[PDB]
Amino acid sequence: QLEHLQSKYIGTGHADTTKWEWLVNQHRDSYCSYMGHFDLLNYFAIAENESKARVRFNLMEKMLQPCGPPA
Amino acid sequence: IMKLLLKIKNGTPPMRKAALRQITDKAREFGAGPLFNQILPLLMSPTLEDQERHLLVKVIDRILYKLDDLVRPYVHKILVVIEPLLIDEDYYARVEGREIISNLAKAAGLATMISTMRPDIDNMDEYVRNTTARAFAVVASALGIPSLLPFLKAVCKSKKSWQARHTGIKIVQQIAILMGCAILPHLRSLVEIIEHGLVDEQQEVRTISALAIAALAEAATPYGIESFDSVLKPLWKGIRQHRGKGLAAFLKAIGYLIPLMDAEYANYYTREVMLILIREFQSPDEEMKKIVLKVVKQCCGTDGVEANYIKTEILPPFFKHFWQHRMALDRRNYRQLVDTTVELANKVGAAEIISRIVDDLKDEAEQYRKMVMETIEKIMGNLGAADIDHKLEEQLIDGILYAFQEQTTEDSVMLNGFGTVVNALGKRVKPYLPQICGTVLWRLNNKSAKVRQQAADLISRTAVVMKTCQEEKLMGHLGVVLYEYLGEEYPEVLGSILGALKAIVNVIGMHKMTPPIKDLLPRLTPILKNRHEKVQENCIDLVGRIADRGAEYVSAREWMRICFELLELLKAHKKAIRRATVNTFGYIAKAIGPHDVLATLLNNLKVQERQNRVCTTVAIAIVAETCSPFTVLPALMNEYRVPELNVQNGVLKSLSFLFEYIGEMGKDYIYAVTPLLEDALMDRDLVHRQTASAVVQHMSLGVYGFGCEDSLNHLLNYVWPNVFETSPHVIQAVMGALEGLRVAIGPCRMLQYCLQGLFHPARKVRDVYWKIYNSIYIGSQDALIAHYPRIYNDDKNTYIRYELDYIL
Amino acid sequence: SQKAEVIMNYHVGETVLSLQKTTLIPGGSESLVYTTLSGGIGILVPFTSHEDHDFFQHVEMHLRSEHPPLCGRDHLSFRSYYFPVKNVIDGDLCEQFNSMEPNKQKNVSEELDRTPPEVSKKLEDIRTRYA
Amino acid sequence: MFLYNLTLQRATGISFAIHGNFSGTKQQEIVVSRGKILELLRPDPNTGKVHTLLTVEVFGVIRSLMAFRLTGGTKDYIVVGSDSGRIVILEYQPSKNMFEKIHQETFGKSGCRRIVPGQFLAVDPKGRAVMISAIEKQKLVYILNRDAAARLTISSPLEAHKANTLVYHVVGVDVGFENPMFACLEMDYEEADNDPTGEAAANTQQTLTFYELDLGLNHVVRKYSEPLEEHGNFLITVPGGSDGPSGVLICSENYITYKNFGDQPDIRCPIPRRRNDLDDPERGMIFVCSATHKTKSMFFFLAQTEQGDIFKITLETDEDMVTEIRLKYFDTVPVAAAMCVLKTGFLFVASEFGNHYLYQIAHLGDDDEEPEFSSAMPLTFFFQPRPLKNLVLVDEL
Amino acid sequence: AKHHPDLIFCRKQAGVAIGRLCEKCDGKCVICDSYVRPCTLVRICDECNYGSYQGRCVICGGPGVSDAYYCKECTIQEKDRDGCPKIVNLGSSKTDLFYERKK
RNA sequence: CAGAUACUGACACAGUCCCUUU
RNA sequence: GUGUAGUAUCUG
Ligand SMILES: [Zn+2]
Ligand SMILES: [Zn+2]
Ligand SMILES: [Zn+2]
């Protein structure tokens, strides 16, 4: 079977995947990638008059449950 | 059920393979009762044939994962026929039980097996008491090891009889043996469980406790000393008062702990045990006489023992009691001694141990000579010969020459020893080449077809050094001598001579060979007609080597005969023959021309055998790649409109190999193949679309990064319709093609195609779309951040990434 | 209904908020000066002849394997972080040729049948002409 | 149409900064890493200006940067974790005036993914192990050692995976010649994705987990995990072992807390507040960076707020138990992303937006006029800012 | 071996142990089973290198003589960032001809 | 459910037995 | 020449 590799990696869906868990992973991946690039955080810290530490803290806090509660 | 069972047991292999399918996925339908009670009594039949056992055990591997909760009631009756299965001396027989009991335990629970199998400990039979330890170990391999510790902590503490403690310690030993390094995280929790048996009042459980602690020590070879802290005293203050076979177990247990110690503990505790180690060198028994040698080797292989001290202490008694004419009777002692002797040379010095056995090859016995020669060759091959002086090298050369001269039976160690010695000496053997050459030639001449191959192998091995020794005249003389022996009837001798000729041709230049190539190839061509594997395997390489560099000495006329004869060599069996037969075509086409050679290969696509068409395909690909791609492409494409199907698929298969071989050069011929893949990806047979998918995969992978996606985007429009298939091969090729295209085009284009029917209201389409999405999602995860679509909010949720709408 | 084709792709790695085409030095040529969000200024000057593009591509391809990045990462993959590279040749890697050991410099130069001074002279000449 | 990409000015955006003896002599250099450029620079102790020695490019973003030295050595190494998906250890060569590749280990794919180590990097202060951890479920630990060849060695990585876990910060606990220990801030979210009512999203605390590295059995296990009251952002290590107590200095919102494993109380001293703030009185106060000036005689700490006010944290203890934390306002500087307390009374400040400064210390802040705060005072502290009066400006970049 | 859809790969972790290849398969890709352009070395987990399993060929399991390698396609596709490729299965096309030829 | 005829996977060919111990 | 998986078509 070729599904061994696809199972050990989180975020992998199946035929019974609901939209909510797809969108929450989509938002979580974007939140994680925001802190990676330095200029992608400079743009956020210049757009709103805040500090880099504050933006990072807010992004980390928002990861607990993005896209609202489930159904 | 019965008809299928006796059709499987007795029938032709195709019928058996066909009938095995309906019995696999129909296990729980019949129930765990009927099929098991119909298939177990047949295995209960005594004197069952060996071919029957594998067939009758393979059905379990397919029917086990259907009755997870239904294998409980008769576990004992199931395993009474499996416990003797994994004790047979056959390597494959043990696996067929070890990999089924583990799966059955994975499909069962502890409370059933433990409850049913607890009263098997108090049994007087030794066979069951020995197989129960392995029964514990195989089920403890799975189901997690820490879950069995609470149960095992009470097994080897019963006051009823020593049988329970013996069984528990044997269980621990087997677990340590067949678990590996998986017991390291909780070694301390296992040491103290069996630590109490070392002072028991019986000479029956101390030995098994020593064996178990030795197994645990060997399992964690480089780590785990602090766990073995409170066991030093019982093992250490227990050897003086112990004698006999029980002392052997203690010595074996203490041998493994020496490497684990630091530079101080090992150094200190080696001296106090070396007294018993020296005293034990003489003994009537041999089983304990090899344990002492193993302990000596293990103590030597440490960073604490110095060189001068060990040289003064162990050598004088070790080299007086073991170098006798009786150790060759047992192979185990032979192997142990030859393995142990090497580390002494590795640590204290090669010469100091070599010089004590150099004057020993001159003996009447041949077993002793064989025993000493492999030790000498192993010592020589590890360190080298930079410490050997003139007298010692002279004595060694004389001894090895005399030993090689005196040959009795078919032992394949003299060749390796002499070759290794000659290679190690290097350029210091110059005054000895004429003698060894004369001896080899004399041995080659007029013998009973058993040492001529030996001499040929020896000269093939030793041809390398003579180039550095500046002795090309004798090389040419040997090459001339070897020519007239090509008429030997025996195949082994002919193969050895061909290998020797290949070695001589390789070592020396092509333009200085004393026998002309023009006088060799006409004689070499008829040789490529024997059905023997060995002669072809080493004649094809010689022919290829000649065609590589010695191609301008040969006119193009006689190459046609070789071209026709090579087509019969693609019908061989070993892949090494075909791997060189294919490459010889590309070697010779560089000198001849890719017009007449390629025409012969095209005709070869009508042999109606699968293993030859693939080889001809690879030959066409390599001949296209070696000379030039464009000079042969129109001829290849012209052979596509013929009504035949195999030749039609041949060019498609050759295109993939050609594109894989050229790689970066495929951006120029990218346009030519497109209006062939375009009508290849039609509603034809599955083979065309299966092969064109691999063609497109290689084509896209070869041009990645050079900005040639304009035609790749057009080609992508044809692969996508051929995704909703069911045959494993076509889908396996199509997913590979899509994955190869996604790296040359980009995930942005593939995401648009994938998102079209992700939330389809069917299921078969959804499964395929989700599989494709997972394949795209695993690779280039961060690259999908900017390519995600925009989704509007529902009643109560936030589905919009507002952070990307900021404007400066 | 009528889509537009893409003729160039690249990945600078930093956010760019300035693009202008204007000559920088008296007697120069038309550049493509941009400005990054971190303080970097770069240009996207094109090639003049055709025998120089092949040499530059060969130098870049050879340095892609004879001089791996300090951290260790495929340069082609780095420049293809989001979209595949297209019709762009990195110049920082080519200018990095001036800093290696002499033996490696000779090994890199010998495939193109040129001396290290010959390679360095034109590498500096192309830079000193557009800016 | 082909294009050639040249460059005119290099990026000057500082993200990380470390200090140490990267050359070998008794002079400390600064390794400042740009967005994708590795740079080296040293200050002149006689005039105060700073020169440039190396501006090598790495061709890739850098997410972490740490420095460490081996036991009984005199050279500092550099550990870089980046988007490359590998771990790299460097070495400065003064003779060649360029870096030197030493080790390279691959432990996953490439790209700023979720489960990919490389974001948080911590090192053992004694220089015996290194921990590289991802944002989730991918904690990895290596074992550094020296052999008879006087060369650094890397062993097999040890996994410390834990599903459904978010990591805020990873720091290395200082222990004196014992097994290495690491600290992290986990927060499970499995229960938050199973309750549609949304009550599980709130009232969910984060724990301070200590990871134990077994140096005799070659495995890593977690021992202590206790819930916290309010969320924090970063941690500060305390020099322990034989010189001072061992513990952490969790800097939560509007508070600073000291916690230690075993049996030890906790100290919570509120952050001082500026006098007569004109902003809305509902915004929290957090720290942005820290520093360490560990010395054999006495050691202190530094911190900086959102407004850019340097404090001076000093711990009080008798043998092992910490009694109180004594804050004291030091100076006011523009907000920076990293500081490096240099020897010979030099301070380097790298602003996140604007020029980069470099100050010298004339007075250490002894017997001042302003009072000092402590956790012993019951119950909203205040202080009055003023000009520097303690530092002078000698160089600007 | 991609030809047999029964074999199971390990995928545990990398390490400092380099895999070896035997005479029967010298220049073959571990996954692709190709013959062109070896690129990168092969690392195996410590579970696949202990005692009797030390210095054995990755694909078949014979006495290794040369180092293993990855093809260029595996490096471009980053298929080497998965763990160790050592086979942990006996197979069905290699453990049946034994009993078929025993008779 | 079976028979027959075609086809695919550079599938492999005395493969050899390397803690099974007294 | 044999064995090890998989797939297509007609008839019963
Ligand atoms: Zn092999
Ligand atoms: Zn490959
Ligand atoms: Zn493995």
UniProtKB/Swiss-Prot annotation, chain A:
It comes from the Eukaryota. It is found in: Nucleus. Residues 6-67 are annotated as: Interaction with SF3B1 and SF3B3. Keywords: Acetylation, mRNA processing, mRNA splicing, Nucleus, Phosphoprotein, RNA-binding, Spliceosome. The modification N6-acetyllysine is found at residue 8. GO terms for cellular component: nucleoplasm; nucleus; precatalytic spliceosome; SAGA complex; spliceosomal complex; U12-type spliceosomal complex; U2 snRNP; U2-type precatalytic spliceosome. One of its GO terms (molecular function) is splicing factor binding. Its main location: nucleus. One of its GO terms (biological process) is U2-type prespliceosome assembly. The keyword RNA-binding applies. The record marks 11 as: Interaction with RNA. Belongs to the SF3B5 family. Component of the 17S U2 SnRNP complex of the spliceosome, a large ribonucleoprotein complex that removes introns from transcribed pre-mRNAs. The 17S U2 SnRNP complex (1) directly participates in early spliceosome assembly and (2) mediates recognition of the intron branch site during pre-mRNA splicing by promoting the selection of the pre-mRNA branch-site adenosine, the nucleophile for the first step of splicing. This is Splicing factor 3B subunit 5. It comes from Homo sapiens (Human). The gene is SF3B5. The chain holds residues 10 to 80 of 86 of the full protein.
From Swiss-Prot, chain B:
Phosphorylated. Phosphorylation occurs concomitantly with the splicing catalytic steps. Citrullinated by PADI4. Residues 33-72 are annotated as: Interaction with SF3B14. The record marks 106, 181, 709 as: Interaction with SF3B3. The record marks 91, 539, 553, 645 as: Interaction with RNA. The record marks 96 as: Interaction with PHF5A. Keywords: Acetylation, Citrullination, Isopeptide bond, mRNA processing, mRNA splicing, Nucleus, Phosphoprotein, Repeat, RNA-binding, Spliceosome, Ubl conjugation. The keyword Lipid biosynthesis does not apply. Component of the 17S U2 SnRNP complex of the spliceosome, a large ribonucleoprotein complex that removes introns from transcribed pre-mRNAs. The 17S U2 SnRNP complex (1) directly participates in early spliceosome assembly and (2) mediates recognition of the intron branch site during pre-mRNA splicing by promoting the selection of the pre-mRNA branch-site adenosine, the nucleophile for the first step of splicing. Belongs to the SF3B1 family. This is Splicing factor 3B subunit 1. It comes from Homo sapiens.
From Swiss-Prot, chain C:
The modification Phosphothreonine is found at residue 115. The record marks 86 as: Interaction with SF3B1. It comes from the Eukaryota. Component of the 17S U2 SnRNP complex of the spliceosome, a large ribonucleoprotein complex that removes introns from transcribed pre-mRNAs. The 17S U2 SnRNP complex (1) directly participates in early spliceosome assembly and (2) mediates recognition of the intron branch site during pre-mRNA splicing by promoting the selection of the pre-mRNA branch-site adenosine, the nucleophile for the first step of splicing. It comes from Homo sapiens. The core of the protein consists of three beta-propeller domains. It is found in: Nucleus. Component of the 17S U2 SnRNP complex, a ribonucleoprotein complex that contains small nuclear RNA (snRNA) U2 and a number of specific proteins. Part of the SF3B subcomplex of the 17S U2 SnRNP complex. SF3B associates with the splicing subcomplex SF3A and a 12S RNA unit to form the U2 small nuclear ribonucleoproteins complex (U2 snRNP). Within the SF3B subcomplex, interacts directly with SF3B1 (via HEAT domain), SF3B5 and PHF5A. Identified in the spliceosome A complex; remains associated with the spliceosome throughout the splicing process. Component of the spliceosome B complex. Belongs to the RSE1 family. This is Splicing factor 3B subunit 3. Residues 15-38 are annotated as: Interaction with SF3B5. The chain holds residues 1086 to 1216 of 1217 of the full protein.
Swiss-Prot record, chain E:
Zn(2+) 1 binds at residues 10, 45, 48, 84. Residues 78-81 are annotated as: Interaction with SF3B3. The record marks 16 as: Interaction with SF3B3. InterPro entries: PHF5 (IPR005345). It is found in: Nucleus; Nucleus speckle. Residues 34-50 are annotated as: Interaction with SF3B1 and SF3B3. Component of the 17S U2 SnRNP complex, a ribonucleoprotein complex that contains small nuclear RNA (snRNA) U2 and a number of specific proteins. Part of the SF3B subcomplex of the 17S U2 SnRNP complex. SF3B associates with the splicing subcomplex SF3A and a 12S RNA unit to form the U2 small nuclear ribonucleoproteins complex (U2 snRNP). Within the SF3B complex interacts directly with SF3B1 and SF3B3. Component of the minor spliceosome, which splices U12-type introns. Within this complex, interacts with CRIPT. Interacts (via N-terminus) with U2AF1 and SRSF5; acts to bridge the two. PANTHER family: PHD FINGER-LIKE DOMAIN-CONTAINING PROTEIN 5A (PTHR13120). Belongs to the PHF5 family. This is PHD finger-like domain-containing protein 5A. It comes from Homo sapiens (Human).
